Structure formats: structure tokens, C-alpha cells
Write a protein that binds this DNA or RNA. Structure first.
Ligand SMILES: *[C@@H](C)[C@@H](O)CCCOCCOC(=O)CCCC[C@@H]1SC[C@@H]2NC(=O)N[C@@H]21
Lengths: 214, 228
RNA sequence: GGCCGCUCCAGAAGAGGGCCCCCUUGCCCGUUAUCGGGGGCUAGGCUCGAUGUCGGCC
């Protein structure tokens, strides 16, 4: 019987100088045998804290750890620019060791509505037998957005995939693609292809659409 | 006294296949450590795989790799190994080697205090294939605030990665190349887009340059607006 | 009634085992390894005890 480590929230936005707290709940008691790691994209984790609250050698003193029952907290007292990263908790009270799913600390900025664009499939692609319809959400903040596909006013499910960039290094926004993949046969069975976008920066949902063949 | 862990041996294998990972350590003795393999699937968290104490030979394994994976160590080389047999797609991950320092004054192993750079393991039955590159064309209907969007759909390639530039690197501002998605076919697909002034469309040329080293492919696609 | 005993019955019978919690390992301890002390439970299902509502002897 393993001990699970549940981390929340999955991500949070903060600004340089903020006090940041990240929490991790053990499914049962681990005493103080909890470690905290920092991981930057494409890099190996680094140990920050062990035994719940003990700072590992060389780790800056703005990092601290605490325990309340099964809830473990990592606190950054004044966030620095090098602290935007993902943080993982881990227990070692009982084998196998187990990790929380991570908390990504991201950069806060002002709300920005997406600019939305829809792309019909190219004739080149249609000739090969497939029809990818792409909907682009450009330079928006925050990350939360809902993209809905409608084909001849019918809500689509299960036939689309989303991909989202990491926060832009210059303006801290996200961009997102949602790709609707139909066979050429299915794509020719319908006329109106519509991408509908909901986001906090928009007073009401934005819809971009086209008619096949126009 | 600089601790280093250098992983090697990762690569692409078919389901059912085998790979041996190596973790070459310096700056400390393997017999004064617990050595670990921890893996991270793309976009996911950390999953412990196996541990070994080279001093005693004691080993432990995640349930899902027992019988398939063997962790070992050669103290004469200060190197730890992960022999991975019967690999399957769900084992695809970056594999990290990590160390826990032994402290004779302590009474149990503590946290993972140093991690290597990681080695990538991809398990897939897909065959190497260069991408098909299709235009994402701007339309007159689609101009917002003096800005147009265009791009390239880079579809059905294997394995990762592709790189995309625009106008041979001359166009960098406003470019977004999205993370690849693994399609149910086992092939990858991504789009690269850029926003540009709409008034430029008649007097500028926009070309996406797609590179897929595994298939030795370099493809240039001119993306131009369609008329009516 | 008496003595001897658990080889079968009874659960009227307590330890082993197992689960949880506190104490930053906290008398002494600790397998290159997570303890110790305290607290909250689990009983007749296995082992070993003990018992008689059991068996033998007189
Ligand atoms: C023996 C000391 C222990 O079993 C008794 C605990 C003392 O407390 C009295 C309450 O007894 C129990 O509740 C313990 C239940 C018996 C456990 C045994 S262990 C082997 C067998 N397998 C299993 O799962 N239960 C029984």
C-alpha cells in the first residue's frame, strides 16, 4: 500500500517579489519525510528542502518548508525571476517513494484576449485524403480558454487536439492551436466550420468560421 | 568535489525491444550512495523506476517494471546501469539518474540530492517518416487590427523533433511553433504560425523552413494568400 | 469430586500477526538501513499459549 502525494494547484501565477506557497497533501502520515524539488524546462530537478523544512546545501533562504498534519507547504518568501519553474513534493517515509504531480509557478501579467484565426484545410492536404482544420488563439492571458468546434452547427467531440505554448519570453502570453482532423469524405459532407473561443479577456465568446468551398 | 552524473544509452526502440542505460558518476563513490532511475514522460511528472545500493547490492523496482528492468552497478567504473527489456510505448520518457549520498551517522536513505541531465527513451512501432507540410493561408476575411495570421501545418512525421524557421530565420517576431502532439496513428503533428501586417501580404513572401533530421528532410513551403 | 494433560469439542481465552495516529529518530537501539516510546483499533479466521463448557486416568 503506497502513499500518494497530491499537489495543488497545478499552476499559479505570481510576480517577482510575491510570497508564494505551494501545498502537497500526503494520503496518510509521512511524519516529516518529505522533500521538495525545483525543475526548469528541459533540465533535471534540483533538491531544495528535505525532512519537510531543512534547507539543502546552497539553496537560498527565501525557500522554506512546513508541515501541518499531512499537508506540506513550500513557501518562497519573495519570488525571484529565476524561481519561475515547476515544484515537486516527494515522500520517503515508506517505499516506494512517490511524487506529487507538480505545481508550475508562472508569470502574472495583465489580462489579454486572444486574437482568433481559423484555417481551412489546404487543397494539397485534401488531395492526400485528410482535412485538418486549424483554429489559432494568439497571445492571450491567462491560460484558461475554451475552444469549441462546430460543424454545420453540430458541436464536435473527440476529433480535435490542442497544443499550447509555454509563456512567451517577451510578453508572458500563451498561444494555442486546436486542430480538427476529419477524413476528406467527412469534411465534404458539411459546409460550415466554426471555432468558438471563450476567454476572460472577451466580453462574450468569439466565433471564427468559414464555408467549405468559399 | 564536483558531483556529476552523465547518462547515456537512450534512443528509439520498438515495442518488445531492449535498451541499456548507463549513468557514469564522478565526484563521489557509488559505494557511498544510493543510485536511482526516475523517469518523466513528456509533459508529465516524475516517476521512480528503480534504486540500487552498490555497497550492498540491494535493489528495488517500481511494480510496473519488475521482471523487465534490472538496475546494476559496476563500482570499478563508478557507473550504474538500467537494463530495460520488453519495452512498450508507455515507457517513453526522459530517464534521469540520481544519487542519494550515504551518511554513516544517519539511519535510512533520505532524498534524491543530485540528478543527472537525463537521457531520452522513445518506444514506438512507427516507422521514420518526414512530415507533410501544408499551408495555413491568410484570407481577406481574416484580417484583425491590421494583422494577418499564416502558418504551416507540419503533419505525420516520426520521430521527434522538427524545427521550423520562417524566411530562413529572417522572420522571428510573432512566430509561435506549437509543441508536437502524438496522434493516435503514432505519428506527430504540429503547426507553426506567425502574425504579420495584413497590408504586407501582396509585397512580402512568407516561407516556412521545416527540418526533420531523422529523415534528412529540409522542406521550404511558400505560404501565400488565396484570392476569392 | 481428585490428579494428569491438550489428542479431538467450546469460545468463556491472551500473546504473535495486521491497520491507523503523535513525537524531526526523542533511555538504549538502527543491516549502505527508518527506529523507539506512547496512543487508537482488529477475536476466535492461522500459530503458540491458557482455560473448561473438553479428553484420559482414579
Ligand atoms: C495476537 C496477539 C493478536 O492476534 C491478538 C491481538 C490482541 O487484541 C485482542 C484482539 O485480537 C485481535 O483482534 C487480533 C486478530 C487476530 C489476528 C490473526 S493474525 C493471523 C490471522 N490472519 C488474520 O488476518 N487474523 C488472524
Amino acid at each position: 500500500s503506497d502513499i500518494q502525494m497530491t499537489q495543488s494547484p497545478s499552476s499559479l501565477s505570481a510576480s517577482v517579489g510575491d510570497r508564494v506557497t505551494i501545498t502537497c497533501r500526503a494520503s496518510q502520515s509521512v511524519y516529516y519525510s518529505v522533500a521538495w524539488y525545483q525543475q526548469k524546462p528541459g533540465k533535471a530537478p534540483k533538491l531544495l528542502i528535505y525532512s519537510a523544512s531543512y534547507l539543502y546545501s546552497g539553496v537560498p533562504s527565501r525557500f522554506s518548508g512546513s508541515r501541518s498534519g499531512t499537508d506540506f507547504t513550500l513557501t518562497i518568501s519573495s519570488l525571484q525571476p529565476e524561481d519561475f519553474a515547476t515544484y515537486y513534493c516527494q515522500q520517503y517515509r515508506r517505499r516506494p517513494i512517490t511524487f506529487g504531480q507538480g505545481t508550475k509557478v508562472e508569470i502574472k501579467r495583465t489580462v489579454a484576449a486572444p486574437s482568433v484565426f481559423i484555417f481551412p484545410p489546404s487543397d494539397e492536404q485534401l488531395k492526400s485524403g485528410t482535412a485538418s482544420v486549424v483554429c489559432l488563439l494568439n497571445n492571450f492571458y491567462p491560460r484558461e480558454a475554451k475552444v469549441q468546434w462546430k460543424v454545420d452547427n453540430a458541436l464536435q467531440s473527440g476529433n480535435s487536439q490542442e497544443s499550447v505554448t509555454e509563456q512567451d519570453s517577451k510578453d508572458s502570453t500563451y498561444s494555442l492551436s486546436s486542430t480538427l482532423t476529419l477524413s476528406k469524405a467527412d469534411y465534404e459532407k458539411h459546409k460550415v466550420y466554426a471555432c468558438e473561443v471563450t476567454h476572460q479577456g472577451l466580453s462574450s465568446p468569439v466565433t471564427k468560421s468559414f464555408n467549405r468551398g468559399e | 568535489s564536483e558531483v556529476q552524473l552523465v547518462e547515456s544509452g537512450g534512443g528509439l526502440v520498438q515495442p518488445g525491444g531492449s535498451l541499456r542505460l548507463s549513468c557514469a558518476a564522478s565526484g563521489f563513490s557509488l559505494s557511498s550512495s544510493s543510485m536511482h532511475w526516475v523517469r518523466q514522460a513528456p509533459g508529465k511528472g516524475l516517476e521512480w523506476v528503480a534504486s540500487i545500493s552498490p555497497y550492498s547490492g540491494s535493489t528495488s523496482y517500481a511494480d510496473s517494471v519488475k521482471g523487465r528492468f534490472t538496475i546494476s552497478a559496476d563500482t570499478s567504473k563508478n557507473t550504474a546501469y538500467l537494463q530495460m527489456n520488453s519495452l512498450r510505448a508507455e515507457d517513453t520518457a526522459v530517464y534521469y539518474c540520481a544519487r542519494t549520498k550515504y551518511h554513516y551517522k544517519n539511519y535510512y536513505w533520505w532524498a534524491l540530492d543530485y540528478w543527472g541531465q537525463g537521457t531520452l527513451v522513445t518506444v514506438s512501432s512507427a516507422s521514420t517518416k518526414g512530415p507533410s507540410v501544408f499551408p495555413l493561408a491568410p484570407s481577406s476575411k481574416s484580417t484583425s487590427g491590421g494583422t494577418a495570421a499564416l502558418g504551416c501545418l507540419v503533419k505525420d512525421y516520426f520521430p521527434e523533433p522538427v524545427t521550423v524557421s520562417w524566411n530562413s530565420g529572417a522572420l522571428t517576431s510573432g512566430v509561435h511553433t506549437f509543441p508536437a502532439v502524438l496522434q493516435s496513428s503514432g505519428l506527430y503533428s504540429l503547426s507553426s504560425v506567425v502574425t504579420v501586417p495584413s497590408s504586407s501580404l501582396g509585397t512580402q513572401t512568407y516561407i516556412c523552413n521545416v527540418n526533420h533530421k531523422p529523415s534528412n528532410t529540409k522542406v521550404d513551403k511558400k505560404v501565400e494568400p488565396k484570392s476569392c
